[PDB]
Amino acid sequence: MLSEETIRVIKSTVPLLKEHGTEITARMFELLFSKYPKTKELFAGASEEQPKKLANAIIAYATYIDRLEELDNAISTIARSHVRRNVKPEHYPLVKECLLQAIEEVLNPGEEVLKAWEEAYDFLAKTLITLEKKLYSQP
Numbered sequence: 158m159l160s161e162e163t164i165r166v167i168k169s170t171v172p173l174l175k176e177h178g179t180e181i182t183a184r185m186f187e188l189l190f191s192k193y194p195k196t197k198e199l200f201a202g203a204s205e206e207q208p209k210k211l212a213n214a215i216i217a218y219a220t221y222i223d224r225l226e227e228l229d230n231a232i233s234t235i236a237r238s239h240v241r242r243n244v245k246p247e248h249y250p251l252v253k254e255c256l257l258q259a260i261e262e263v264l265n266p267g268e269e270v271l272k273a274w275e276e277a278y279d280f281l282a283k284t285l286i287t288l289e290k291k292l293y294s295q296p
C-alpha cells in the first residue's frame with residue numbers, strides 16, 4: 158500500500174481537486190482523445206458529464222485513500238462500467254499520462270504532488286484491473 162507520506166500529500170490536494178477537478182478532467186479528456194484517438198470509441202454513447210463524474214471519483218478517492226473500504230461500492234461500480242465498455246489494462250497508462258499532465262498544467266503543484274498522484278493512480282488502477290479481470294471471467 159501507499160506510504161503515510163504519500164497519503165498525506167494526496168490528502169493535501171483534496172481542496173485543489175474540489176476547486177479545479179472538472180477543469181483537470183476536461184483537459185485530461187482533451188489530451189487523451191487527441192493523442193490516443195481510439196479511446197474515443199470507449200466513451201461514445203455513454204452518459205453525459207464525464208469530466209464531472211471522473212472529478213468526483215478522484216475527489217472521493219483522495220478523501221478515502223486512507224480508508225479504502227469506504228470505497229468498496231464505488232470501486233465495484235467503476236469496475237462494472239469498465240467491463241461494459243471493454244476497458245483493458247493497457248488503457249490505464251494512457252489515462253495516467255493525460256491525467257498527470259492535466260494536473261501539472263492546471264495545478265502546477267510541484268513534483269512531490271505529481272509523484273504522489275502517480276503512485277495513487279497506479280494503486281487504484283491495479284485494484285480496478287484485478288476486479289475487472291475477474292468480472293471478465295463471469296457469465
Ligand code: HEM
Nearest residue numbers: 196199200203204210214235238242244248249252281282
Ligand atoms: C484509476 C483509473 C480510473 C478511474 C478512477 C476511473 C473512474 C471511472 C468512473 C468514476 C467511471 C463512472 C462509473 C459510473 O458512474 O458508473 C468510469 C467509467 C468509465 N471509464 Fe474509467 N476510470 C479509470 C480508468 C479508465 C481508463 C484507463 C479508461 C479507458 C481508457 C476508462 C474508461 C471508462 C469508460 C469507457 C467508462 C464508462 C463510461 C460510462 O459508462 O458512462 N476508465 N471510470
